[PDB]
């Protein structure tokens, strides 16, 4: 029996007539993969694929809505000009950027090769969500024992704890999770840096060996557990003064 299978073929019917190593043509399954597994929390939308068939050029307008931070997601809108045969991207332009990502995307999108731009935007959204999750975890761990508050527009966490040794002097720790978008310089991906800063009564510790300690603990325990152990070391001397 000879059967013709297309993009709308049933999964069971495709597995009936599968004897090649080519990927499955069930296009609902392909888009389910593309939406749920490789790029979750991204509401892509295409609304106009009109063409100028005299020139053989396809005009595509798509909207990328990075909805990982569902409270205030940032969205972008591209415009691509295809060649539709001997495929060359003659021109691409950015139609609209959400204002809450407009500066970082303005520095990033100034360079060409929009594939790097899309991957960098998705990676920056993912890394910012990871930053918010890590900071929320540390806040929930240290909400009641210490005083937790975010500043530098939620890029630095300040944890303060008074200590016994004097007339109740305070020990405050600042941990940073600054995220940098590559505009001037060594690749296209959005980078992230972690550094700590410790104060006891208003006197800054030496940043060299403190950064050595931060590097060692993060290298040993990862990021979440590493930052937890940095907080435990730099906030609770009485627990470790045996």
């Amino acid at each position: 029996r000879v059967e013709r299978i297309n993009g709308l073929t049933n999964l069971q019917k495709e597995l009936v007539t599968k004897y090649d190593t080519l990927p499955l043509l069930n296009m609902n399954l392909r888009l389910s993969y593309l939406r749920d597994h490789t790029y979750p929390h991204l509401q892509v939308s295409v609304q106009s694929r009109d063409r100028v068939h005299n020139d053989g050029i396809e005009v595509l307008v798509v909207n990328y809505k990075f909805c990982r931070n569902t409270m205030n997601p940032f969205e972008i809108q591209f415009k691509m000009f295809y060649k539709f045969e001997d495929s060359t991207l003659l021109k691409w332009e950015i139609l609209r950027i959400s204002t809450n990502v407009r500066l970082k995307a303005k520095q990033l999108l100034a360079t060409r090769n929009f594939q790097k731009c899309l991957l960098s935007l998705y990676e920056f959204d993912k890394i910012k969500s990871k930053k918010t999750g890590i900071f929320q975890n540390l806040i929930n761990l240290l909400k009641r024992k210490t005083r937790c508050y975010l500043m530098n527009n939620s890029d630095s966490l300040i944890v303060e704890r008074v200590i016994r040794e004097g007339r109740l002097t305070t020990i405050k720790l600042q941990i940073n999770f600054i995220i940098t978008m590559p505009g001037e310089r060594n690749c296209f991906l959005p980078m992230s840096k972690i550094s700590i800063a410790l104060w006891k009564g208003g006197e800054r510790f030496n940043q060299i060996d403190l950064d050595e300690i931060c590097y060692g603990l993060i290298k040993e325990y990862g990021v979440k557990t590493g930052l937890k152990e940095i907080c435990n070391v730099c906030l609770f001397p009485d627990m470790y003064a045996r």
Binding site: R144, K145, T146, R161, V162, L168, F236, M239
Partner: peptide, 20 residues
């Protein structure tokens, strides 16, 4: 017990600041 100690130190700070 760390939570209780932090609350106690906050109370010490309260009575210290309300004092002269």
């Amino acid at each position: 017990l760390q939570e209780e100690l932090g609350n106690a130190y906050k109370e010490i700070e309260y009575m210290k600041r309300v004092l002269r």
